[PDB]
Write an enzyme that holds these catalytic residues in place. Structure first.
Site, mmCIF file in Angstrom:
data_model
loop_
_atom_site.group_PDB
_atom_site.id
_atom_site.type_symbol
_atom_site.label_atom_id
_atom_site.label_comp_id
_atom_site.label_asym_id
_atom_site.label_seq_id
_atom_site.Cartn_x
_atom_site.Cartn_y
_atom_site.Cartn_z
ATOM 1 N N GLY A 17 0.840 -1.208 0.000
ATOM 2 C CA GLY A 17 0.000 0.000 0.000
ATOM 3 C C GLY A 17 0.868 1.247 0.000
ATOM 4 O O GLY A 17 2.023 1.202 -0.434
ATOM 5 N N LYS A 34 0.398 -3.597 8.669
ATOM 6 C CA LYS A 34 -0.158 -2.277 8.449
ATOM 7 C C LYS A 34 0.544 -1.337 9.407
ATOM 8 O O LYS A 34 0.208 -1.270 10.592
ATOM 9 C CB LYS A 34 -1.665 -2.272 8.693
ATOM 10 N N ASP A 121 -18.170 0.806 3.885
ATOM 11 C CA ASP A 121 -17.496 0.912 2.605
ATOM 12 C C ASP A 121 -17.241 -0.458 1.977
ATOM 13 O O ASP A 121 -16.133 -0.768 1.524
ATOM 14 C CB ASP A 121 -16.189 1.647 2.784
ATOM 15 C CG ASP A 121 -15.610 2.143 1.478
ATOM 16 O OD1 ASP A 121 -16.306 2.186 0.428
ATOM 17 O OD2 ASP A 121 -14.418 2.511 1.495
HETATM 18 C C1 LIG Z 1 -3.294 1.977 2.610
HETATM 19 C C2 LIG Z 1 -3.763 0.598 2.096
HETATM 20 C C3 LIG Z 1 -5.198 0.073 2.414
HETATM 21 O O1 LIG Z 1 -5.977 0.771 3.069
HETATM 22 N N1 LIG Z 1 -5.594 -1.154 1.967
HETATM 23 C C4 LIG Z 1 -4.845 -1.988 1.215
HETATM 24 C C5 LIG Z 1 -3.856 -2.792 1.778
HETATM 25 C C6 LIG Z 1 -3.104 -3.678 0.999
HETATM 26 C C7 LIG Z 1 -3.347 -3.806 -0.359
HETATM 27 O O2 LIG Z 1 -2.625 -4.638 -1.178
HETATM 28 C C8 LIG Z 1 -2.306 -5.958 -0.976
HETATM 29 N N2 LIG Z 1 -2.561 -6.651 0.157
HETATM 30 C C9 LIG Z 1 -2.203 -7.948 0.317
HETATM 31 N N3 LIG Z 1 -2.440 -8.716 1.455
HETATM 32 C C10 LIG Z 1 -3.005 -8.278 2.626
HETATM 33 C C11 LIG Z 1 -3.206 -7.040 3.072
HETATM 34 C C12 LIG Z 1 -3.775 -7.168 4.280
HETATM 35 C C13 LIG Z 1 -4.208 -6.030 5.216
HETATM 36 N N4 LIG Z 1 -3.920 -8.433 4.562
HETATM 37 N N5 LIG Z 1 -3.468 -9.074 3.609
HETATM 38 C C14 LIG Z 1 -1.550 -8.555 -0.781
HETATM 39 C C15 LIG Z 1 -1.278 -7.830 -1.972
HETATM 40 N N6 LIG Z 1 -0.629 -8.348 -3.069
HETATM 41 C C16 LIG Z 1 -0.638 -7.607 -4.390
HETATM 42 C C17 LIG Z 1 -0.011 -8.267 -5.491
HETATM 43 N N7 LIG Z 1 0.260 -9.724 -5.270
HETATM 44 C C18 LIG Z 1 0.999 -10.346 -6.405
HETATM 45 C C19 LIG Z 1 1.067 -9.908 -4.083
HETATM 46 C C20 LIG Z 1 0.176 -9.589 -2.897
HETATM 47 N N8 LIG Z 1 -1.668 -6.538 -2.003
HETATM 48 C C21 LIG Z 1 -4.336 -2.999 -0.932
HETATM 49 C C22 LIG Z 1 -5.088 -2.104 -0.156
#
Ligand SMILES: C=CC(=O)Nc1ccc(Oc2nc(Nc3cc(C)[nH]n3)cc(N3CCN(C)CC3)n2)cc1
Length: 248
Positions: A17, A34, A121
């Site tokens: 993020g 986080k 949301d």
């Molecule tokens: C400020 C960021 C927010 O509010 N939300 C958020 C947080 C992470 C996010 O991307 C993301 N969160 C993940 N896992 C999470 C996050 C949480 C809290 N639990 N497990 C995994 C992930 N990937 C993106 C591309 N992939 C190939 C690898 C993994 N992206 C997208 C949005």
């Protein structure tokens, strides 16, 4: 004062993020970290997520109180659902897998409903996906019910409105609702009783479900537990004679 851990115990490995990281906790368990600007509000700003625990909801494992801030959580293999729908897996998905995905989250929300919380949301960007098409609730007028966008009446029944909008994202592989209309145009037309047509190849009986979530009277919108059971039973009870088409 419980949940508390030493800062040495969590190695942060890759940014996500803008922050949020993937890491390891006690050199074993894979985790989502986080961070907190120390801050940013910051110790305001957790107990909300400590009060809730369920399979289709994302889990808080542990915390760091004194600054700088840290929160550790369940890691979701496949990231957020909006990215998953548009990107590579977009073109391969079909109704059977899309209605199961939709069912799982209806489960998450039937916990929140039973617990008397309100999410406020719910939408595809805020669902996370894991291995085996597992989806979970985690952590913008087009997605927001009328009562809520206008007058601030946020309830479990504003979340189900948003659900039905999420059903349209599943059905178009992640297109923004109300194609070609900006947020002010949505707001006025929806007040008229306009409501998006049946997407191409999406069966009429699912579009009805969409249309039931979007009723101008909050009370009349169904529960999440109805919503779950309906999507669970779809291919036997509603469209037994379903046939694969070009996109669905
Ligand atoms: C400020 C960021 C927010 O509010 N939300 C958020 C947080 C992470 C996010 O991307 C993301 N969160 C993940 N896992 C999470 C996050 C949480 C809290 N639990 N497990 C995994 C992930 N990937 C993106 C591309 N992939 C190939 C690898 C993994 N992206 C997208 C949005």
């Amino acid at each position: 004062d419980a949940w508390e851990i030493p800062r040495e115990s969590l190695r942060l490995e890759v940014k996500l993020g803008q922050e949020v990281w993937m890491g390891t906790w006690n050199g074993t368990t894979r985790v989502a970290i986080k961070t907190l600007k120390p801050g940013t509000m910051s110790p305001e700003a957790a107990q909300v997520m400590k009060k809730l625990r369920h399979e289709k909801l994302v889990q808080l494992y542990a915390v760091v109180s004194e600054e700088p801030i840290y929160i550790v959580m369940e890691y979701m293999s496949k990231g957020c659902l909006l990215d998953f729908l548009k990107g590579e897996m977009g073109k391969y998905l079909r109704l059977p897998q899309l209605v199961d995905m939709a069912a799982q989250i209806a489960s998450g929300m039937a916990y929140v409903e039973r617990m008397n919380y309100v999410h406020r949301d719910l939408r595809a960007a805020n669902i996370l996906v894991g291995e085996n098409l597992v989806c979970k609730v985690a952590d913008p007028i087009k997605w927001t019910a009328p009562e809520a966008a206008l007058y601030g009446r946020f309830t479990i029944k504003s979340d189900v409105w948003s659900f039905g909008i999420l059903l349209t994202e599943l059905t178009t592989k992640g297109r923004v609702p109300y194609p070609g209309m900006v947020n002010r145009e949505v707001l006025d037309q929806v007040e008229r009783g306009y409501r998006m047509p049946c997407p191409p190849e999406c069966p009429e009986s699912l579009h009805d479900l969409m249309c039931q979530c979007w009723r101008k009277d909050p009370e009349e919108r169904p529960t999440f537990e109805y919503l779950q059971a309906f999507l669970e039973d779809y291919f036997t009870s509603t469209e037994p004679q379903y046939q694969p088409g070009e996109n669905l």
